[PDB]
Write an enzyme that holds these catalytic residues in place. Structure first.
Site, PDB file in Angstrom:
ATOM      1  CB  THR A   1      -0.882   0.029   1.235  1.00 45.06           C
ATOM      2  OG1 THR A   1      -1.820  -1.035   1.166  1.00 45.06           O
ATOM      3  CG2 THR A   1      -1.646   1.338   1.367  1.00 45.06           C
ATOM      4  CB  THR A   2       1.667   4.114  -1.725  1.00 47.44           C
ATOM      5  OG1 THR A   2       2.785   3.244  -1.921  1.00 47.44           O
ATOM      6  CG2 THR A   2       2.147   5.524  -1.593  1.00 47.44           C
TER       7      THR A   2
END
Lengths: 203, 227, 227, 227, 227, 227, 227, 227, 203
Positions: free
Chosen positions: A1-2
C-alpha cells in the site's frame, strides 16, 4: 500500500493507490483505501484489510452521530484523539493498521495514527510499504506555497514513484481534495488519468 | 382498582397504566407528517413560551440520520432519551450491514424498547409518541409509535394535543402525490384547523426529504411564506 | 380478592390474571386457519380504520419461515415481540439441525416463553393468541397458542372477537380434505357468519401452503373473487 | 388472612397457596395407573372437545424414556414444562451413569423442583399432579407427585376430577398380580365408576410395560375391545 | 399484627412466622429416640393410610450414612429436601477429613441452613423437626432440630403430634444404660402411652446402632414381638 | 391517589412524584444567569445564616471546568452529588476527544442521569435544578435542567424561590448584547425585584466569562460596587 | 405505625424493629461478667428444663479461642450463628497477623455484622446480646454487644432477664481488683439477687482467665462450693 | 402520609424519613468544635451512666488520622460504622497521593456515602451527625455533616441535644483567633450554658491541634482546671 | 479446493470443485463447496471444512431472517459487510476460511472475504489452493463482453486447469448462474459433463 496526505493554505489533499496483495500474490487490483468520513474529513487505511475496514465503518458511524448530537462537525484533532483512544485501549490485541486522518476545521490538518494509538500532526505524512519513496519525493519537491493544482500533481507524482519501486503498491491513483468551500471532492478518474499523461508517466 | 401497576390486567384485559401513559402524549404540542410525490415531510408547532428562550434550542424535529427524521410529543425528558436511542440504533444497523435498508426495522427496534417497559414491574412506560419519516430502499416512509410500543405506517398522521382536529382534517383533504410546495400548504392548513377561535399560528418547523436527496430543514424565512 | 397478582392461586385453583390476559385476546379481529387436501391455510379479517393507513402495513399474517406462518390476536405490541421471537427460534433450530422437522416444537418453544411469564412475579403475561400453520416432515400442521402457554393442534380453528361464531360454524360445515379453492370459500363463509346484521366484509388476508411447496400470499385481486 | 403468599404459614402451620395450587389439579380429567403381574399400566380419560381438534395431539400419557411414562393433571402449560423437565432429567442420569437404575430418583428430582417453588417468594407453585410408571432394576414402579412436591409409591392410584370415585373403587376391587388383559378391564371399570348417571365413556388412552420389554401404547382399535 | 413476615419481630421480640412453622411439625406422626447401653435407637409410628400404598415406601427413618440416621416430622416435601441435604453434608465432611468425627457438627450444618431461612425475606422456614441418632468418636449421640434452627442433645426425645405424651412418659420411666431389648420395650410403651382410648398401635419402625457396629433396621417380624 | 410512587402515571398522564421533587427546588435561594455581548454570567443570592459559618464555604456557583460553571437550587446534598457528576462527565469528554466542543452535550449527560431516576422504582428523583453557563465552539451558552431531566437553552433564566419575580422582570427589561458591567447591573436589579418590602440584599456571588477567556469569580469588594 | 420495617425511622428518630429485636434478648437467662485482679470471669445461669436433656450440651459460655470467651442471651439459633462467626473472625485475624492483639477489634467485627442487618431491608436483626471476655496485649477485657450493633467496655455487666437486678446490685457492691475466689462469690451474690422469693439457684457455669494463662471452665463440683 | 419511605417526596418536596433520621441526632449528648489562633478544637460532654462502665471506653472524639478528628452524635452503632469508614477513606487518599491535602474532600466522601442512603429504597439513612476538625494545606478546618449528607464549614458549631443553646451562646460570645487556653474556656462556658438549672457539668473530653503539630487529647486532670 | 466467481452484464457465475483432502489423503471425492444462501446470492467456501460449514448455516439462517423482517433480500454488499464483521470480531480465534459471496441486487457483484474479515469487490475472484491457476486462465481469457454461455465455459475451463496442477483439487465441477430473471440456477451435472466433452477435457 501507499497512501499520502498533504496540507496547503486552505486545502488538504489525500491520495492512495488500489492494490491488495495476500503476500506476493496480487489478489485485487482495485480495492479502496481512501474514504470520506465526515463533511470535511477523510481517512486513508494501510495494514490488515479487515481491521482497517471495521475502523472505517466505526468512524463514519461515530462521526455522523457526533454531528447530529452537536450540530457541528467533530474537530479534526478530536477525530485523531478518538482513534488514539480506540487503538490504545486494545494495544495488546490491536487493530493492525496505519491511518491518516485529514480534514478542515478552522484550519487544515493531517494526522498520522499508529496501531498503538500514537497520533501526530505533521504538514505531510505517508503510510504503507511505499511510504518511504513518497517521503523522498515530498522532501525534495514539496512547498507550503504550492497551489492546489500543483499539489494534486505532486501526490500523483509521489505515488507513481512509489508504485514503481514497491511491489506492494499499484493500480489507479485515487485523489481527494478537501476545501472549506467545496468540501470533500473526490477527483474523477478521467481527470487524474489526464494528469498522469500530462506529467508523462505509467500504470 | 387495576390501574396502579403496569403488570396488572384489568378484568376486561386492559393495561391502564399504559393508557394513562398515553395521556401524557396529549399534552405535547401538535406535529404532523405526510407523504407526497417522491417525498415525505414533517411539520411541528412551536408554542413560543418567552423571549428569553433560545429558539434554535429545543425544537422538536430531530434528524436520526441524514435520510431519517423524527418528531416527538409527550414528556420531553423521555423524548430525548428515545431519540438518542433511535440514533444509536440506526448507527448499529449501519455498522452491521453498511446501510439502513428498511426504516421499518429502526422503528421496530425503538418500539420494542418501549413495549419492554410495559411488561416488567419496577419500570414505568415512556410517556412519548413519535413520528418517523424518511427515505429508504422501499421508498418514502412515514410511521408512528406510542408508549405501548404500537406501530402504524401512515400516508399522513399527527401526534400531540391537536391530533384529532388534524387527522380529521386530513381525512377530508389529503391527496396522494402532491408536489412538495402544495403538501406543505395542505399541512399548514391542517395545523391551523386545530387551533381555537382566531388564534395566531406562529412559525412552525418544517423538514422535508425527496427521493435521491438528503433531508432539508426549512429556515423560518422560507416557512413564513406559507403563513 | 385473588386476582391482583400472577403468582396467586384463588382458592378454587385459578390464576385470574391469566384469564384476564385472555380477555385481551378477544379484542383482536377474527382470524382462522384450516387444514385441507395436502395443505393448510390462514384467513384474517382486515377492519380498515382509515384511508390514511398503509394497507400493506401491519396486516396480521406473518411468515415465520418459508414453510410456516402465523396469525395473532390481542395486544399488537406483544404480538410483534412474539412473532419476532418465533422467527429467531425457528432459525436456531435450523442452525442446530439444518431443518425444522416438527413445527410442534417451534410452537412448544414459543408457548414455553409465554408460560414462563405466568409463573414469576414482576412480569405480566403476553396478551396474545397465535395460530401457527405450515408444512413439515409430518405433514400439514395447524396449532394455536394462548397467553397461558396452552397448545392444541386443530383441523380448523379461530382466534379473535368472532372466534365463537366461527368455531361454531366450522363445527357444522367443516370437511376434511377439500380442495384449496373450496376450503377458502368455506373459510370466507365462516368469517361472514361472525359479523352482525348485513354488515360488509371487506378484503381479508389469505395465505396458503400445500405439500412440496412454499407459502403463497393471495393478493387482494385474487381474494376478491371469493367475496 | 394468610393465604395470599406462598411463603406465609397460617397459625395452624398451613401453606394455603399450596393447597389452592392443589385445587388446580382437580380440574383435569381422570387418569389412573396400576401395577400388575410383572408390569404396570396407565389409563387416562379423553374428554373429546370437538371434531376439529386433532386426537393424536395433546393426549396425556407421555413417554419420559423407553421404559418410563407419565400422566398429568392440572394446568396444561405447567404439565408440559414438567414433563419436558422430567425428560431432560432422565437423560442426565443416563449420561452420568449409563442407565436409570431407580425411577424413584427421577421422580425425586422432579418433586424437588416442584417443592422449590413452594419455598421462595416471587414464584408460584406448579398446578400439576403426575403419575410416573415404568420398570427399573427394582421392578415395576408406580409413583405420584403433587404441587407441594410430595411423593408416594402406589400399587394403584389416580389423579384428576374423578380421583376419589376411582381410588374408592380400587380400594374394594384391586388385586395384586393380575394378568395384563384383566388389569386393563379392572381399570376401565374403575374409570366408568367415576362418571355420573349413564354417561358415555369414550376411548381412553392405555399404555403398558411388562418386565424385560419396552412401553407399548394401545391404539384406539385395541382399546375399544374393553368398552 | 406482626405475624405476616419472617423478618419482623413482634414488640415482645417474637418471630411469629417461625412459631407457626413449628405448628406444621405437630401434624406429623410421633417418633422418638433414646440412648441406651453403648447404643442409640429410633422408633417411629406408621399411620397406615390404605392397602394401596407400598409400605417400604415412604417410611420415616432415613440413614444419613452407615453410622447416622434421622426421623423427621412436619411437611414431607421439606423433610425430604433436608434429609438429602444432610446426606450430602455428611459426605462433604468425609471427603474433607476422611471421617465424621463429631455428629454434632453435621447437625449444626443442617440447623444452620434451617436458621438461614428464618432471617431473610423472600423465603419461608422449613416446616420440619428432625431427630439425629448415631455413633461417633465421642460415643452414642441423640439430637433434635427444629424449624428455627435450634439444637439440643438428648438422652431421650420425641417429635410429632404425640411428643408431649411421650416426653412426659419418658420423664418418669427412662433409665440410662438399659440393654437394647429393654430400651425398645420402654420405647414402645412410651409410644402406646400417646394414643387415645384403646386405639390400636400398628407396626412402627425401629432402627438401632450400638458402638463398634453399623445401623440395623428391624424388619416388621422382629418388631411384632414387642407389640 | 397516584402520587406515592415514581413509576405510576396518574390518569391524566402525570408523574406526581416528579412534580413534588420540583417543589424541593423552590426552597432554594434564587440564582440567575444571562447571556451578554460575547459572554455569559451567573448571579446567586447568599442568604447569610450566621456569623459562625465560613462564607467562602458552601456558596453555590461551582466551576465544572475552566470554561463552564453551574448554580444549583434544591436539596444541597443532591446538588453536590450532581455537580461532582457533571465535573467527572466533562473530564471524560475531554479524555475521549481532547476538548468540550458542545456544552449542550455535557448538560444532556447530566439531564439523562436525572431522568433515569424518574423511570425506575426503588430510587427517588434528584431534588435539584441547575443552571449551566460557559463558552464553547458554538459561543456563549446558558442552560437549565430540572429534576425531571428537562433541558432548555436560555438568554436569561433563574432558579430558586424568587424564580418568578426574576423571570417576570427580565421578560420586561432584558436586552441582548449588553456590555458586561450593565448586564451585571440588570441582573442585580432583577434579583432585588424578587425580595419583599424594603428587605436588604446582601452580597451575592457573581461569575462571568467572555469569549476567548477563562471564568472569573468577582470577589465581594468588586461585587459591592453594584449594590 | 412505623414499627413494621427495619429501614423506617419513626418521627422521633427510632428504629422500632431494632428495639423489639432487643426484647428478644430479655427472654434469655441471666449471665454476667466481671473484671478482677489480673483477670476476668463469666457466670451464667442454667435453668434446668428436664432430666432428659444432656447438661454438657447447650450451656451458654463458649470459647472463641483459648484466651477469649462469650456468653449469649436471646434467640438460641442466632446466638449460635454469631458465636461461630466470632470464632471464624478470630482465626482470620490470627492468620493475617499471627495474634489477636486487641479483642476490641474482634467484637467490632461481630458488632458490624449485627448492625449491617439493621440497615438493609429484606433481613431481620439478630435477636441476641453477647458478652465477650478475655485477655489481650492491653490486659483483661470485658465487652458487650447488642442486636443494634452497639459496643460498650465494662468492669462488670450482665445480659438476660435478670440484667437489671444484677447491674443494680453490682452498682452497689462491685470493687476493682478483687481476688478470683471473691469475685466469683460477689458474682454469685449478684445472680441470687435477681431471682424472686426464696427460689433455688441451681449450679451456674463459671469460666475465668487470668493474665499469662489460658481459660479455665469450673466443673460443677468446684462451682457448688460457692452455693 | 408521605413519611413511610425514604424514596418518596411529600407534595411540598420533603423527604420526611430524612428529617426523622435527623431527630435521632438530637438524642446524642452535646459536642462542639471551634477554630482559634492557628488551631481548632473539639469538646464533648460525657454523661456518666454508671461506675461500672470503663471511662476510656466509648468516649466520642475519634482520631481519623494524626491531623484529623471527629465527634459524632446519634445512633452509636451508625457513628462507629461511619468513623471507621472515614478512617479507611483517609488512608485511601494517602495511598493515592501520599498526603491528605484538603480535608473538605474526606468529609465530602463521607457525606456522599450518607446521601447515597437517602436515595435508594431498601436502605435507611444513617442516624448520625459528625463534626470534623483538623489541619491541612489550607489551614485549620471545621466541618459538620448530617444524615442527609449536608456539609457546612464553620468557625464554631455544635451537635447533639444542646446544640441550640450552644450555637445561640457562641453566636453572641465567639471571637476569631483567641489563644488556645481561652477558646477552651469559652467552649466550656458554651457547654455549661446548655444544661438546665444548677446541674453539674462533669469532665468533658477536649482535643486540640495547632498548625505544624499533631493532635493532643487533654487528659481529665488538665481538663478539670477549666471547670 | 478451487472456487471461482465472475461477473458479467446481468449475471454472476460461481463454480467450485468437490474434493476434500485431510493432507495428501483424498478422504471424499464429492463434497459440496457452492451454496445458495438467498434468492439471488450464493457463497463458495475454501479452508477448514468445519468452520466453512458453520458459516454456511449461519448465513442461510440470518439472510432468510433478514428477508422476512425487511421484505427485501439483503443487498449483496450488506452480506459481505455482515461477514466482514463476524470474522473480524473473532480475528484472534478465527474461522479459517476464504469465502466468495456472489449475487444480484440492482447490479451483479462478487465479493472475496478473508479470515480476518477483509472484504473486497472485484469483477472476478478465485479462492483455494487452485486459485492461482484460475487467475492465470482468467487473466488471459476473460472479457466483460462475454455472454453467459461463454462464461460458463470459461469457468469450467479455469477449474479444469486448476484440477490438473493442484492435487488439493478434483472431482466433478459444480456451476451456478445467478440472474435477475431466473434467479439462482444450479446447472445440472449432465449439462456440465456435456460441455467438458465439447471443450475436449478430462476428470
Amino acid at each position: 500500500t501507499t497512501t499520502v496526505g498533504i496540507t496547503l493554505k486552505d486545502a488538504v489533499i489525500m491520495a492512495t493507490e488500489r492494490r491488495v496483495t495476500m503476500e506476493n500474490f496480487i489478489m485485487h487490483k482495485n480495492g479502496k483505501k481512501l474514504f470520506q468520513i465526515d463533511t470535511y474529513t477523510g481517512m486513508t487505511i494501510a495494514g490488515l484489510v479487515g481491521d482497517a475496514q471495521v475502523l472505517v465503518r466505526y468512524m463514519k458511524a461515530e462521526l455522523e452521530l457526533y454531528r447530529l448530537q452537536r450540530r457541528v462537525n467533530m474537530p479534526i484533532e478530536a477525530v485523531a484523539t478518538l482513534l488514539s483512544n480506540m487503538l490504545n485501549q486494545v494495544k495488546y490485541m490491536p487493530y493492525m493498521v496505519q491511518l491518516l486522518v485529514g480534514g478542515i476545521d478552522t484550519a487544515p490538518h493531517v494526522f498520522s495514527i499508529d496501531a498503538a494509538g500514537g497520533s501526530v500532526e505533521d504538514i505531510y505524512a505517508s503510510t504503507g510499504s511505499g511510504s518511504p519513496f513518497v517521503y523522498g519525493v515530498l522532501e525534495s519537491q514539496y512547498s507550503e506555497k504550492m497551489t492546489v493544482d500543483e499539489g494534486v500533481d505532486l501526490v500523483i507524482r509521489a505515488i507513481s514513484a512509489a508504485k514503481q519501486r514497491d511491489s506492494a503498491s499499484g493500480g489507479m491513483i485515487d485523489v481527494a481534495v478537501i476545501t472549506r468551500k467545496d468540501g470533500y471532492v473526490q477527483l474523477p478518474t478521467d481527470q487524474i488519468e489526464s494528469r498522469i499523461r500530462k506529467l508523462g508517466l505509467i500504470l | 382498582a387495576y390501574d396502579r401497576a403496569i403488570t396488572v390486567f384489568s378484568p376486561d384485559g386492559r393495561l391502564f397504566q399504559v393508557e394513562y401513559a398515553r395521556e401524557a402524549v396529549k399534552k405535547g404540542s401538535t406535529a404532523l407528517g405526510m407523504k407526497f410525490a417522491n417525498g415525505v415531510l414533517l411539520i411541528s408547532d412551536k408554542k413560543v413560551r418567552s423571549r428569553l428562550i433560545e429558539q434554535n434550542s429545543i425544537e422538536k424535529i430531530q434528524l436520526i440520520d441524514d435520510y431519517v427524521a423524527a418528531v416527538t410529543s409527550g414528556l420531553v425528558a423521555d423524548a430525548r432519551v428515545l431519540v438518542d436511542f433511535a440514533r444509536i440504533s440506526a448507527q448499529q444497523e449501519k455498522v452491521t450491514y453498511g446501510s439502513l435498508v428498511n426504516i421499518e426495522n429502526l422503528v421496530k427496534r425503538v418500539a420494542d424498547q418501549m413495549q419492554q417497559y410495559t411488561q416488567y414491574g419496577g419500570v414505568r412506560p415512556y410517556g412519548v409518541s413519535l413520528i418517523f419519516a424518511g427515505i429508504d430502499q422501499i421508498g418514502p416512509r412515514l410511521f408512528d409509535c406510542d408508549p405501548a410500543g404500537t406501530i402504524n405506517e401512515y400516508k399522513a398522521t399527527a401526534i400531540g394535543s391537536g391530533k384529532d382536529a388534524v387527522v380529521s382534517f386530513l381525512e377530508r383533504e389529503y391527496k396522494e402525490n402532491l408536489p412538495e410546495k402544495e403538501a406543505v400548504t395542505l399541512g399548514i392548513k391542517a395545523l391551523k384547523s386545530s387551533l381555537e377561535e382566531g388564534e395566531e399560528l406562529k412559525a412552525p418547523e418544517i423538514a422535508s426529504i425527496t427521493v435521491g436527496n438528503k433531508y432539508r430543514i426549512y429556515d423560518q424565512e422560507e416557512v413564513k411564506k406559507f403563513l
